[PDB]
Design a protein around this nucleic acid. Sequence first.
RNA 1: ACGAGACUCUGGCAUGCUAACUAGUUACGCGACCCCCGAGCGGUCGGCGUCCCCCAACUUCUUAGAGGGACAAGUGGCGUUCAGCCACCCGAGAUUGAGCAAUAACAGGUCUGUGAUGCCCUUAGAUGUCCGGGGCUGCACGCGCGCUACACUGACUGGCUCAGCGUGUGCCUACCCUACGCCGGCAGGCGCGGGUAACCCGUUGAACCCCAUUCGUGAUGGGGAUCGGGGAUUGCAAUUAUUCCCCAUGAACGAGGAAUUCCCAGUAAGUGCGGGUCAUAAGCUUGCGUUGAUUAAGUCCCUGCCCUUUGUACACACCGCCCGU
Lengths: 141, 191, 75, 64, 137, 70
Amino acid sequence: VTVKDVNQQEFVRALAAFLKKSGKLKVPEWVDTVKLAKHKELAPYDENWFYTRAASTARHLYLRGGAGVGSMTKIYGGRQRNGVMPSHFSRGSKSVARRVLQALEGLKMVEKDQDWGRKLTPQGQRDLDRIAGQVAAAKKK
Amino acid sequence: TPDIKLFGKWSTDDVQINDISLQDYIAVKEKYAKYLPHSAGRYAAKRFRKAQCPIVERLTNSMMMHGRNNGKKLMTVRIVKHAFEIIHLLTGENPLQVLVNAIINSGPREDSTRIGRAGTVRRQAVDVSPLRRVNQAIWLLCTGAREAAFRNIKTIAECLADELINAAKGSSNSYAIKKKDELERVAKSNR
Amino acid sequence: RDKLNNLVLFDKATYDKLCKEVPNYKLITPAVVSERLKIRGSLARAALQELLSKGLIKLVSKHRAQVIYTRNTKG
Amino acid sequence: RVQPIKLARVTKVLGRTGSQGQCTQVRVEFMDDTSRSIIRNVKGPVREGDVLTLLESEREARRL
Amino acid sequence: PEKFQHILRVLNTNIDGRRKIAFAITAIKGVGRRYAHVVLRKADIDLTKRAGELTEDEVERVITIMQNPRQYKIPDWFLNRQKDVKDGKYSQVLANGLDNKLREDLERLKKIRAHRGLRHFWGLRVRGQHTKTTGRR
Amino acid sequence: HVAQIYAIRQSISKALVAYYQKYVDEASKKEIKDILIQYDRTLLVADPRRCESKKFGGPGARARYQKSYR
RNA sequence: ACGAGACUCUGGCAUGCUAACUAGUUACGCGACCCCCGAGCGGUCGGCGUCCCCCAACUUCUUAGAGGGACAAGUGGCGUUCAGCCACCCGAGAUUGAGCAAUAACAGGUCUGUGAUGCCCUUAGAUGUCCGGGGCUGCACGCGCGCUACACUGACUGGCUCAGCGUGUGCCUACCCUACGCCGGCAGGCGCGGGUAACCCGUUGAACCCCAUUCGUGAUGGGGAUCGGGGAUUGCAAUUAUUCCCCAUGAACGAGGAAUUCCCAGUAAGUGCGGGUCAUAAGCUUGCGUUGAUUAAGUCCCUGCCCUUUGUACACACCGCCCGU
C-alpha cells in the first residue's frame, strides 16, 4: 500500500496515535497558551494537538517536499476576520511551525535536503508508509 | 440507458404521477434518471428547457436563498439526500412518491391576475399553466422550510422532510398547502 | 421572549423516562428528542451517545450537521 | 355545489396580453370529451399542445 | 446527575451554573474566553464537565490562580495590566476592583489635564475618530 | 474542486472514446458513444460556457452600483 | 455621403501545421535511488518527497504565429411567397463581451493638469516662493455610495484539498518582490541565497465550500462598536490614538415603514486574490478566478425613447402661456 490510497483525514489521526506512543519528540513549554495562528480567537480545544500538528506537517512533506517555515505557514491559514472590515488571508504562526520540524529532527523523521528544503529520510518514509499498512488493512470505502 | 435505473441508495422506477397534467414536467424518467442530482449546466436556455431537469435537481437548486446561503450547491445536495432518508423512515414509500404527491399538493389551480374588468385595472381570476403550478410549489415549499428552520433547533433535513411529508397527505398543515388553498380561496372570491 | 427550560442534567426519573419510549421511534434524531423533552441537544446527543452504547438504538448515518437513528427492529 | 374539475388541452396559443403581457389566451379543448373549446387566459409558460388543469370551465374569458 | 454545584457566587460575581465551566468563568469582569481557557488547563480540569459538577475543592484552586497569574508560569503577555504607571504590578485584575483602576487612570488624565481625559470629561470620541455621521445611537 | 470533477468525468470518458477507435472497431465507439450521449451530453462535449469580463460599474459583469436621487 | 452595419480586440474548438532546459514533457527508457510499502515468498505490478546528459520520443495539455471554421448552409413549416421568421439532425446554429461612434447643441465641468491663454487682482508689510507648529477629521442635527451582522444551511476548534489576471530593484533617485536557516506566542527580527523575470518568489498548494468535536433558541460563544493597560513597524514628527499585535469592557441590532436601486446565463448572488492610490495602506475603486439558482422569451400599465397622422392662444418652447375679486 501507499499513502496515496488511504483517507487522509483519518490518516493524520492515525499518526496522532504514533507520536503519543513514541511520546519523546518534545512538547514545548508554551503549548498551553499559544494560538497556532495570528487570526484565530481561541486556542484549540484539544490540548494534545502537537501530535496532530506534527502529524500534518510531516505528512505534507511526503507530498510536497522542500518545504520550510513558509510552505507550512501558507497551508495554515484562513479567514482573518477583522470584524467590520472584510476578511482576508493571514498565514499561521512561524515559531510554532518550526518547533515541529526541529522536534522531528531529534526523532530523525525529517531532514534538511538540498535546496535547503525539509525532506524525508529513507527510514523516515518507512514510518509514514508503515502506518498506512494498518489503516488500509482495517478500512475499505 | 444503464443496466437499471438506480440512485445507488434509492431506485427511480415505479414513481407514478396522479395527474395527467403534470407528466412531461414532473420529470422522473425523461429518458433516464441521474445517479446523483447535480446539473451539467446546460439548462435555462429556452423557456421549456427548464422542464427537462429532474424535479429533485430543481428542488436542489431552490434551497439556496436569502443572502449568506447563495451559491452553495454541494451543501444542498447534502440536505436533499439526507432529507429523503428521513421521509423514508417516517412513512415508508420512496420519497419521490412522497415528493411527487407533495409538489402536486402545493401548486394552486388558479391565480388572481390583474386585468381590466371595471374601468380601472381590476383582478379577474385566471388559470395557471402546468409549468407555473410546478414552479410555484417548488419555491413555495422551500419558503416553508426556510421559515421553519430559521429559529428552531431542528436540523434542516428534519424540517424539510417533515414539511414535505405533510403535503403528500396535505391537510391544511404544511405551509405551502396552507397557502395553496388561500391562493385559490381569494381567487374565487373575486372574478 | 419566553424560555424553553432545556436543562443541563438528568434526574434518574427523566432518564428512564427516555429508556422505554424512543427505540420505537421511526425517527431518532437530536432534534426530535429536544422537541419531545425540555432538554438541550448537548445532553440528548450525549444521551443518544449513552443509549447508542447499550445497543437499543441503531445507526443509519452519523454526519457533521445531523445524525440519524431508528428502531431496534422490535416488530 | 357540484365539483366539475375538467382536464383539457390547448390547441393553439392565441396571444399573450392583458395586464403587462402576463396572461395568455388559448382555445383549450378537453382531451377526454372533444367538447366546448373554451377560450381562457392563463398565466405562465404554455407549451404547444400541453396539458392543462382547470377548475371551472364556464368563463370564455375573452378580451374583457 | 443530581444538582450539586449549580448557580453560585465568586468574587461577588454570579456564575451561570447551567453552562460549561469555561465560559461560565467569563461571566466575571476582567476575564475573557481565552484567559478562562488557560486557567482551566493549569488547574488540570476536564473542560467537558458542566458547572453543576465538581465542588469547591477544585474551584478553590481556580480562584487563587486567577487572582495571581504570575505564580503559575502564566505567560505575562496575557495579563491586561502590565507596566502600569501605578506600582508596576503585573497581574490580571478582576471584579469591580478593576473598574476602580479605570476610574483611576481616567482620573489620572483628568488630574493632570491631558488630552484624552479632556475628551472623556465631555464623553465624545477619544481615539481620534469623527462624528460627522456617527456618534448618535 | 468541482471544476476538476467535471474534468475527470469527461477526460476519462473521452479517453475510452478515443481509445476504442485506435485499436478496436468503430462500432465499439458507437455502442458506447450512443449510450454515453443518450445519458449525458457533457461526458462527450466540453462545457463551452466560461466566465465573462467585468465592466466598470457593478461589482460583476452586469450588476451596477446604485444611483443617487436628490 | 455620414450614423448603423462593415472593422479591431476578446472568448470558445481545431488529436492538423513551423516550433520550443526559461513550458509541457512524463508517454517512455525504468538508466538509476527509496519504503514490504501491499495482492504479491519475490519479480511484473503501485508509488515515488526523488536524479539525470542529450548521444531519448515527441507536442495532447503550456505558450502563440499562420491557418481553418458559420454562411438562413441542409430539411420542414409560415410569408404578396421578395425581404424574412419559427422549428430541427448537424455543430462554435447565424447570439461572448466590449472598443469604435454621426447631425445640431448645452452659456453642462474643468482657468485647482498643463510654458496653452485674454482681461482684471497683486508683486516686496507679496495674492511669488521656502520653513515651523497646527487646520482640511471639530458635534444638538439631517443627508447620499458602502463593509459588518442580526445567526444552528451558524459560530468556535482540527483535518482536507483546488485558481486566474497581473506585479516585483538604481529612474531627472531612494528603495522593489521574497524563498530558505535560526530567535520571538504573535505582531516582528537577524545572517543570509535567488529575480530587470515562462528562469527563484510561484507546480502561485487562496477562501466560502468538503469530513469530525463544542455550542443549544438563550443579546448565547451571534454582533464586534466603545473604553484602559500594555508590544512592535515605516518616518525629520504618530499627541487630536498611521498602521499591526495582546489581554480585557461586550453596547446598538430579533431580517427592517413610506419609498427605491441592480439584474435575465457561468449573469444574479457568496467567498477570496491582484492593480491603483502606497515611505506607513485599504471598508474605495479598476481587474481575476472560484461556488453556482429561482423568474421571465412579454407587454406598453408607470418613468422614458424613435417614426407617422391630427391639435395649439407654446417658441429662453408646459419648468409654457393665462384669467378675475
